[PDB]
Design a protein around this nucleic acid. Structure first.
Length: 107
DNA sequence: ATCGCACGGGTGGATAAGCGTTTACAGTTTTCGCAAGCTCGTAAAAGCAGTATAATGGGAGCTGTCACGGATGCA
């Protein structure tokens, strides 16, 4: 089994469990590998990062929880690896170039 | 393969501070509304003086009955 089949399984590993507290100590242990070694092979298969991409699906989930659900900004961050919305609102100007308040207005 | 270690990138984390937006909790101004209290007015209630043939002593339904002592008080 080549490693390009490993990371193909890893793209369906998280697509249901980004609302869960999913950390690297779960992803590495339930893959059969170590904590660091999964990140070296992750570059040569999809050209992007791993610890930011789980945020990139988490910040994708916050936008589809804002354009559909009435949940506030402060405690969507509580389930997605943040302890407050102060940093969680800040990276959204990097990921989608918008404010977490301004997305729901422009339809 | 299996996995750390490091230089360094990215960040998360702990105060902190930011932003425009729609109401508090501070204090007075305004108007309107209806009284409780005073003043009043007169029709009703309240009070007062007089009435010139002549008239001059209650009882007025009472009590219908018991009988034994003490003090009182004339005689």
């Amino acid at each position: 089994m080549s490693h390009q089949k490993i990371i193909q399984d890893l793209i369906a590993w998280i697509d249901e469990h980004i609302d869960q507290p999913l950390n690297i100590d779960v992803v590495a242990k339930k893959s059969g590998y170590s904590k660091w070694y999964l990140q070296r092979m992750f570059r040569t298969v999809t050209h992007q990062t791993l610890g930011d991409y789980i945020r990139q699906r988490r910040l994708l989930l916050a936008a589809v929880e804002l354009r559909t659900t009435e949940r506030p900004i402060f405690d969507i961050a509580m389930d997605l690896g943040y302890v407050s919305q102060q940093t969680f609102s800040r990276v959204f100007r990097r990921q989608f170039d918008r404010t977490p308040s301004d997305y729901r207005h422009r339809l």
